[PDB]
Symmetry: C5
Subunit: 310 residues, 5 copies
Amino acid sequence: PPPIADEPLTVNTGIYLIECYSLDDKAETFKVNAFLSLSWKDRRLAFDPVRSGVRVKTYEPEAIWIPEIRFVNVENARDADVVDISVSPDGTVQYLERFSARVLSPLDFRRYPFDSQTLHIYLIVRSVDTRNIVLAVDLEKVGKNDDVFLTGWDIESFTAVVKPANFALEDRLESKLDYQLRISRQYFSYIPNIILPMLFILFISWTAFWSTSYEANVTLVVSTLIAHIAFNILVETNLPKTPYMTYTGAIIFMIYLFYFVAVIEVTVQHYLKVESQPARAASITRASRIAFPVVFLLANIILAFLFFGF
Amino acid sequence: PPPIADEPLTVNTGIYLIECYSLDDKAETFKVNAFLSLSWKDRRLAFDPVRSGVRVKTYEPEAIWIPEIRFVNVENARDADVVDISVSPDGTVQYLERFSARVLSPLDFRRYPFDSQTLHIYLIVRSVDTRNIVLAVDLEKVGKNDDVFLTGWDIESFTAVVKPANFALEDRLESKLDYQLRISRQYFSYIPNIILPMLFILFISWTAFWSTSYEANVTLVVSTLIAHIAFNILVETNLPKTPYMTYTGAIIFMIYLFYFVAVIEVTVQHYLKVESQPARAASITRASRIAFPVVFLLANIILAFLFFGF
Amino acid sequence: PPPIADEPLTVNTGIYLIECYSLDDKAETFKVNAFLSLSWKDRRLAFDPVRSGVRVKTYEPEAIWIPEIRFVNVENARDADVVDISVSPDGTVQYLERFSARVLSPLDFRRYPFDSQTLHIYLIVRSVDTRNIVLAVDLEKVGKNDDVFLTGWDIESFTAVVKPANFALEDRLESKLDYQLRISRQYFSYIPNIILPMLFILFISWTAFWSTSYEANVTLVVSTLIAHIAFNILVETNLPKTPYMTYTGAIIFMIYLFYFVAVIEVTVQHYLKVESQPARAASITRASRIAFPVVFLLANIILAFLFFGF
Amino acid sequence: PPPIADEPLTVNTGIYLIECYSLDDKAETFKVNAFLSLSWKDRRLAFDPVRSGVRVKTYEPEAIWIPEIRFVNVENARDADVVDISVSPDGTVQYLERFSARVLSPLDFRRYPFDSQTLHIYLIVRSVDTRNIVLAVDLEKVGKNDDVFLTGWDIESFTAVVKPANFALEDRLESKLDYQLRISRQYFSYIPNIILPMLFILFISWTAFWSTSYEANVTLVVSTLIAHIAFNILVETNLPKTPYMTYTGAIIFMIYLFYFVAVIEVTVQHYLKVESQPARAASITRASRIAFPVVFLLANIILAFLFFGF
Amino acid sequence: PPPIADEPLTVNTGIYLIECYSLDDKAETFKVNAFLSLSWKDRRLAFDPVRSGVRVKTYEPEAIWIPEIRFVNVENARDADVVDISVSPDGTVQYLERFSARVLSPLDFRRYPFDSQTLHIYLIVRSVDTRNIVLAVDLEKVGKNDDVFLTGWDIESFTAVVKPANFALEDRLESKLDYQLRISRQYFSYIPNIILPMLFILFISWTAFWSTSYEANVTLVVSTLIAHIAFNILVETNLPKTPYMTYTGAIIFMIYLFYFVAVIEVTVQHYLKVESQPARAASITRASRIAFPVVFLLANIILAFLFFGF
Ligand SMILES: [As]
């Protein structure tokens, strides 16, 4: 029984994030528990303040006509309990629910450990024989507590795109709003636990530039190459199959090279020291001790620049 | 209370993919959230536009008779909320729901990292005492947004087989339609993370063709063979037990060989260099340095051709 | 309101597997989505074909009395939507639902990678003041599509034990039926990925029978022993804690020995070659080169026979 | 509308375990699916057998007053469907539901691999203005099938403490019963997969008591110490953070020592063989070959005794 | 239909923890099952003890007006069954439910293995046209059994902040209470399983201060460094991405250093012993044997003090 109008009826929205959690980088989802605040004029139930009852009248959902506000990017039906409904005299309705649903917004792992994100929540609404435009009421959208969690993410700002996007979808127009959740990652625990350890093994790797024993140079460059897989694999696991290239996947891969040419040297410092030409060998080995850490720290300035600096 | 007809009543279908996600290579499933668009003439509730009400009359599901459209290949009951029902004058019904269910379509991992897929959604409908034929209405089947996600897959085309398949199933005929979702994989993250690293270790493996120390040749060929298991195991994990042979399972296995004959050589370059016949040894070792990388790159053109080229 | 009878009322059952999936070796469960087909004579609602309406009358569940058919070996309440109910003239009822529940049937991993299974679905029904006997109607039990999936398993046959098992359970007799799903595993991906790789490392292991360097023989036999744990652990993970012995757990363990005595040899080929008695040493080493691969392939014929051949 | 009585009304309980499963050592829970059997005299609905109807009258739950029997140690609300209600003439009610809930009973991992357990299910009931005492009816408590599963546990006995525990809880007395599920673990798969492999590596560890090469003794004692972590870590994972000491955590830890002093020896057999005093060295090494396996098998008799024998 | 009052109506709260469990360090949640005890004067249904019925009258929830008490920090809607409602003569209501919900309270891993925690449960209540103030009744808040579990945590005290926090939230004041659950961790299983094993490997690490073989010193210091990752990774897994530094993450990282300088020494004890200057080498090696374990145990007093002592 929709509110007989003279034009496209505006429904006024708003979301108060109460709880945020389980951001799942693999799945590219995250769970939210918030308030949903709808309101619209349904003159059809305006009500003579003095003549009867009081300032505002309380209805159960079954009584009033309520707009079907579906969330767009959600796994399942949003999971909402109704908090209160309050019809003002002029026929204005005040709806408030408290839903909790897991939201499917994409993430950009291009700078992985040092990435900032922008999550979305949507809200469409399909029309009947009066059109429905949704729009935001920013006093109910200051949604976000001073307790909004989201482990391992700094939360920057919950805003929303005031202007809705009105489509035609199957001979019935819908109206979609964009609620924006901006977050930066807490890179850090990525250092003592990934970056640093990763580097350390790389350095030991090429301690075999001050060594002559092939036996203890393969026992050296090869042992460390293994541990790098232990890190490549550790990192690769908590991260989805991007069709593009990650920052850490870059360096984690660039690293794979400095182990190949590392193993190339140790190898050549021998077919060239069993060829009785140690003239050359400890000339090369001697060089490597510079070329490598340089080319590296060089290729990291090259690489790091390539991602953040551009 | 089904619509009294003069022949098999046609129900007109359509699916607008809203969200796509969690394609699960192991489970051979994927989750979809879409619009379901049904429509049929139920002359039984045609309604004198002028004489009463308006252009089109809105019903709740309980009022009208609605056709039971079950999805065929689904784990559980499809999970739908109803968006709107609109009976036209002539007795034509306009049904629209917005379901979300996880769909069990098979995948062909024969070219694994470089595979294209064709997912299916089904929709049967069993008949009563008027026969039901389903068929597609292509304005509600343009289903698929410009936002359809499906991480790590390029989505090519959502179409549908116009001609339904009508069975006899238990003394009651059913009608099944075929909705087709064609996707190609985003192979790539498979290179810096699998293929390349995998190859690199293989090359280091046979750096022991320019070495004479058995000690550092086993510390060499054997250490790399381990890391290959680290990749065989990593790859074997995100991939089901195909009764056939994968492409990467091919080369990942072909590889296992170039480590066995590699370890064969290093081994023989010694029972033949402690047999005071280094005449032969460094004749073999010398050859291996070619035979191997050739036979390999040869067997990869042979293998690769065997899969893609045929 | 149960159908007043003159004897134990027979309810006629049937299950059409529509979808099969998520067989979970660890959990010993599997999920099924099928048709449930019940039927019984309730003369109490026979209905004068000519005198009124038509050939058959359609009821909602609330109207008719329907038998409580519970599935026995199920995690939770079976998850069924009703497809149609059709009372024939003589008072015969035609019930059809389409449930989906996850089923707890045990598996026998005794031949693990090469095992065939026999899954069960149950269906009890408890009685009131007329006894209920269930029994199968084999036209609704041809249940199983030509699309029944079950990844990594060949499906052999869906049948059912016609004769029900009628118990006394708490001063009320119940009647249970046995629906049988027979499957063989798709052993194979177990070869290029487990068996073969496992063997290869074992062979390299005992390449140290043609070597004299203890340094490169422990670097040899020990490195491979590690990789075998990487396989024991890989295999042990996707497999429950059987109180009995698995086939692959056999050979995977038999293998642990050929590494212990392998490491015994290399070890003794030294306290007996530093004891200036290489007379003996390269007599033993020389032998091992046969004893081992023989005793092995021997113990595998012994072992394999012990499991399959008996 | 509770049954007007002359004293504390006894409600008669009973539980028929139908299914048992998912015992979760980490979570200290387990799932059960059983019958709940309640019964009480509500003279208020006694009913003249001859005068009307029949022997016993069937009610829906809404009609009768039923006692709120909550399970105490449960994660969520118990998940029950009602099987039948049958009021006898004298006003006696026969209630039967078939719930399934996951139960939070603690476990004692003190003897871990060789531990027996005693699970609990509770059932309280709070009173109104007639007191409620619960008590057991042992014909409906023989609950437990001949099919009760519980993977990896031998089920010994389902009994119940006849005398209830009646508290005062918030100015209203409750009555709690204790249903006892006694199980022993199927230790075994813990031997070929943990205990044995664990020991084997320990033995190889100290094969370096018959060796003199420090290079191949560290390559020896150290490589095995790693693999022990692979087992410490494997075992530690499927086991919660006990504030006390596990048996296997004992020996798994005692083991850590025999690798420290093992590495101590190999180390000292060298700063004492490069000190040109091999007089002593191969005197120690010689001793270790006994002290170790003895002190070990000794400390295991000491340790094992300490846990089981006391 | 809220209770017509003369001022802000006080609702009297209380929570009897019945069950506690699944504290999830990664998720920063925990599950609780307790009694919720509300009470308020609704003079509107006072009732002439003598004139009618009895001492107290029992209502179903639908009859009375009940206050909407939502829990604040909860994932989903709290999951409550109602235990009893009892209106006293004066119009006093006695409400009692038994909810079970999972609670999102944050934890401070700053002292990780040796940390004490303070969990929160909240309870807001929004007002209508009489204000609602909640407040605690400490006879229904002694909530907590003598059976409160919470595996791997010692439970210290369940109390509550008597003075509520009254906000203005969207032109309607709410009232929030703070229920406090204080727990200390059962550090311990962290020693035989983490701390000790971790240390042991560190000690073996630097057994290469009494060794001269580079081959057996890298096979030494490097093998142990790996095992440390096996522990860093084991520990890092059951612990969230703190933006701050953990205690064990400190020492687990401080440790990474004593392996780098350890490997630095062994390395330098060689480019300085192949430089025919063993004068210096076995002067350094000799020193390390002290500097290390000291600087360590020193840096641990330094470190441990830095966390607990301040
Ligand atoms: As190694």
